[PDB]
Design a protein around this ligand. Structure first.
Ligand SMILES: CCCCCCCC/C=C/CCCCCCCC(=O)OC[C@H](COP(=O)(O)OCC[N+](C)(C)C)OC(=O)CCCCCCC/C=C/CCCCCCCC
Ligand SMILES: CCCCCCCC/C=C/CCCCCCCC(=O)OC[C@H](COP(=O)(O)OCC[N+](C)(C)C)OC(=O)CCCCCCC/C=C/CCCCCCCC
Lengths: 52, 439, 439
């Protein structure tokens, strides 16, 4: 699981790998209200649930 | 001109600073922390290393009982075993079939490998932070190396720089650490002179070249086995040969905040905690007078395509009318949008192009282009890749204030509810007034 | 038998502790802190020594004009003066009376003689306390030295002493200190590379052999006088020669708690703050079985003289009858009356005398000779001398246990007032009783 803090993976004697997550989502933020709330749900789930 | 700014203590992300000295064209500084280092003040407690038991040749008395001596050696232990009858290769060593007593003695001492193979137990008092920085001073990359304790002002190209102190006193190390060769471990090693057998520190020494040795390995001798001249004993194995297999991961791999660890001296590089107060002293000659810089008019923007991914997913096109040719420092008035460039060349009746990185679903930001602002607006789209290998170029998560246009649904519904409540309140208050008029 | 006790951190004052173990005769240890040392961990910042101005011979250009050249000397400064007409011993130097110029150049460097006359500014993080102790073991003085951080265990006469940690972390050193030979001053020296002219630190070097010199003496060249080839200048006098005659008082004259301060390494010796928790772990061979100890009956004490004069001003004569000759460890459990000796030979039916020091205005206390208890009572006269040169050899505590035996005035007055109050309350109760039955 890659959190927003980022993940560092060291594999054997290789140099550690670093991974960070983007703001990818399936919804759209300029369409119908269900679409935009789904978008903000995929981005920030807890915050969007509490605010709605 | 003394300028003071604070940037987050994050390595490798090129930040931006604005120095708006009045009467002079605005100055944009692109500073990038190449490395920050924390170095605790060590205080060696003792040096541990694998011991060795020193067993001199046993003394076997052909007749009568040998006498046990006494010494002050670190773990000296003597014992007298009676009734022995040793055999050598040719025949019986002792003349008489009994009454022979063997004097077995042994003690411990540091091994020869203690010079090279050893583990140092220290104490970490307080780290003297140091830093190295890259700044695009006057549009050219220059590097600045200085301490980060609020002292040691450093100069380059006549411009002073003094950085720190770090807003975070957090250090990866604890009050006690050990180092083996390049690995450092936080562990609460036993007090000197009280090492338990088998565990780490059964034998302790102040320095590798010291002669005083404290060793607690419960060396116990045992009776020779049925006509042989050996000296057997029952000693707890080395606690350091055991620790070496039982080490576990060192701080290089377990420390938080993406902390690196080095040795000679022990450091902690590129920790991500806190922010860096960086204060510059930019001389008057560095600035250019405002009349010298050009003036831009009729600026119209456009965003052909935008994507709110990290690594500068947006691109904007701005028309211009720049009067004289010169260096037009470009800047972004909005925190949420970080434009890539720091200055471009403008002259004529044409347009330019920029790149920016944002986390907003709807672009809304003002571009400071050589004292003349401009408004840019576009709809950003989500990225296609779930994860990437670099930290986000843009500032941070958009705060709850900044939603996306077509949030107008929120305003619509809240206005409708407020309107309903308003008509309800007006009806109630007019009824209350007319009922107050009764009698 | 491990026995943890605490003694006050005062140096040179003996303290008696009671080690009592069932089945063994009680043991009393007389211990006395010989010295306590605090060793700060130093992280040198920079060395300051008086500068020297290096003025090369002037370049007077005959019938021409010279030009300034730029270099990166620590405080380099050059100027060109026109219209000069210098002379020499034989005659005028330049051919023409006008159009002559002189190039004056100078900079500053550390005095290469000042590898000794330097003052070094440090930082002090924390002190590794170390203590040297003298304990009276079984009628023998044995001296023990150990670290006072509680992380050091030593041994002598097969007895293990672990001393520490210090109760108080107070140290006479601030974070930033300077040392000059034997003197050390708490002062917030200017940060590196930002020294002020004329004050301490105008010329800063990292280490006395390091070649990087930061100097801020505001050297300013001046116009040569008419017809002379000298190179005049205006420089702020050395800040270190100015400090040397304005230092003030070293810490060994200013620090509180009667602190004593030394250097190389810097130390704070014999602080009077806090208390020292000394833990003693003693073997069973040292003890003596209760049956093996003498038993004394019919102990009666008489005190012919007593004076609370800080130097054992009382003498108590104790009659006794003892079973067998032996060593009885006398002790006083009244923690206001210290007694000098810790054991005395007993035999048959004989007397003994002890010397006790108190501050009580009426000496009333119990003495445990070996295991039996005797009660002592005496009257104290105040001493005649107002001043003594040694710390008091006893302790002072709260009032309730220090009032004279002639405090009977307090009891009489309080009892009389209580009696009259009780009588008034009883009369009021009786009057209420009839008034509660008359209605
Ligand atoms: C038909 C239906 C269609 C309708 C469409 C539905 C729309 C649905 C969506 C709305 C979008 C919500 C998603 C926003 C989430 C963004 C993430 C975020 O929001 O997180 C921002 C930061 C990061 O999170 P953190 O844990 O690091 O920070 C807290 C640190 N900790 C824990 C120590 C306290 O958090 C912070 O800094 C926040 C700090 C607190 C900020 C207070 C907000 C200021 C305003 C307050 C109300 C006043 C009214 C203003 C009105 C004025 C108008 C005139
Ligand atoms: C006819 C009858 C004849 C009989 C007459 C009998 C005589 C009566 C005698 C009493 C003798 C007292 C002797 C005991 C004294 C030893 C106590 C002690 O060992 O202490 C001494 C310390 C040492 O001085 P220093 O310089 O180290 O400390 C100050 C530090 N510097 C200077 C930085 C501020 O002095 C201190 O600290 C003390 C600090 C605190 C003292 C104030 C006490 C506060 C009490 C308040 C009571 C409140 C009333 C209750 C009412 C409630 C209603 C029911």
């Amino acid at each position: 699981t890659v959190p927003t803090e980022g993940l560092e993976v060291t594999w054997g004697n290789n140099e550690p790998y670093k991974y960070w997550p983007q703001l990818s989502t399936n919804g759209t933020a300029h369409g119908h209200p269900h679409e935009i709330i789904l978008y903000y749900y995929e981005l920030y789930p807890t915050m969007t649930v509490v605010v709605v | 001109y003394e300028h003071v700014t604070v940037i987050p203590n994050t390595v490798g992300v090129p930040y931006k600073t604005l120095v708006n000295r009045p009467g002079y064209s605005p100055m944009v500084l692109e500073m990038e922390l190449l490395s920050v280092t924390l170095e605790p003040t060590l205080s060696l407690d003792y040096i541990t290393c694998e011991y060795k038991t020193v067993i001199p040749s046993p003394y076997v008395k052909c007749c009568g009982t040998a006498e046990c001596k006494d010494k002050s050696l670190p773990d000296y232990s003597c014992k007298v075993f009676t009734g022995v009858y040793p055999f050598m290769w040719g025949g019986a060593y002792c003349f008489c079939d009994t009454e022979n007593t063997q004097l077995s003695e042994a003690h411990v001492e540091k091994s020869e490998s203690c010079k090279t193979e050893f583990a140092s137990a220290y104490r970490a008092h307080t780290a003297s932070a140091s830093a190295k920085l890259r700044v695009l001073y006057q549009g050219n990359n220059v590097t600045v190396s200085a301490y980060a304790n609020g002292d040691h002002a450093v100069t380059v190209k006549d411009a002073k720089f003094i950085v720190g102190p770090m807003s975070s006193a957090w250090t990866p190390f604890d009050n006690k650490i050990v180092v083996y060769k390049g690995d450092v471990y936080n562990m609460d090693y036993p007090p000197f002179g009280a090492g338990r057998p088998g565990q780490f520190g059964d034998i302790q020494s102040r320095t590798p070249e010291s002669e005083d040795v404290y060793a607690n390995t419960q060396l116990v001798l045992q009776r020779p086995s049925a006509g042989t001249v050996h000296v057997p004993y029952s000693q707890a194995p080395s606690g350091f040969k055991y620790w070496l297999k039982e080490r576990g991961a060192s701080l290089q791999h377990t420390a938080p905040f993406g902390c690196q660890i080095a040795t000679n001296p022990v450091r902690a590089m590129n920790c991500a905690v806190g922010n860096m107060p960086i204060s510059i002293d930019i001389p008057d000659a560095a600035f250019t007078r405002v009349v010298d810089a050009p003036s831009l008019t009729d600026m119209s923007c456009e965003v052909p395509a935008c994507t709110h991914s990290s690594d500068f997913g947006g691109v904007a096109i701005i028309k211009y009318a720049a009067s004289k040719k010169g260096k037009c420092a470009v800047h972004s008035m909005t925190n949420a949008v970080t434009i890539r460039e720091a200055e471009i060349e403008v002259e004529g009746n044409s347009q330019l192009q920029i790149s920016f990185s944002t986390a907003l679903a709807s672009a809304e930001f003002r571009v400071q282009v050589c004292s003349t602002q401009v408004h840019c607006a576009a709809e950003c789209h989500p990225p296609k890749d779930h994860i990437v290998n670099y930290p986000a170029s843009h500032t941070t998560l958009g705060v709850q204030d900044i939603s996306v246009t077509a949030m107008s649904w929120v305003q619509k519904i809240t206005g409708g509810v407020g309107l309903v409540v308003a008509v309800a309140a007006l009806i109630l208050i007019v009824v209350l007034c007319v009922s107050f008029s009764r009698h």
